Structure 1
Amino acid sequence: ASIFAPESLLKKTKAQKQSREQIVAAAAEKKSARQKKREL
């Protein structure tokens, strides 16, 4: 009845989620580190 979202797409989306999680965490701590660095 419906198309089942190909398994290559599911594997990529899981991989992209891992990388997107890393990017946010890296930028989350970068902003705090940059603000302290600017004051120094």
Structure 2
Amino acid sequence: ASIFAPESLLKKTKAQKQSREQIVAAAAEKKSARQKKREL
């Protein structure tokens, strides 16, 4: 009755989740550096 998600989907989701974390982490830093650069 319950169809488990494919295991390749779980592996891709873990990889995509990690890549999104780096993008967001390097996006808040990008905003701060841009504000400091623009003042300079």
Q: Please, what is the CA RMSD of the aligned residues?
A: 0.4
C-alpha distance after superposition, 1:1-40 (max 9, x if no partner): 1110000000000000000000000011000000000000
Which runs of no fewer than 5 residues in structure 2 stay unpaired?
Answer: none
Question: Structure 2 length normalisation: TM-score?
Answer: 0.96
Paired with 1:37 and 1:30, the residues of 2 have a C-alpha distance of 10
Paired with 2:5 and 2:28, the residues of 1 have a C-alpha distance of 32
Question: Structure 1 length normalisation: TM-score?
Answer: 0.96
Aligned residues: 40
State, as a whole percentage, how many aligned pairs show the same letter: 100
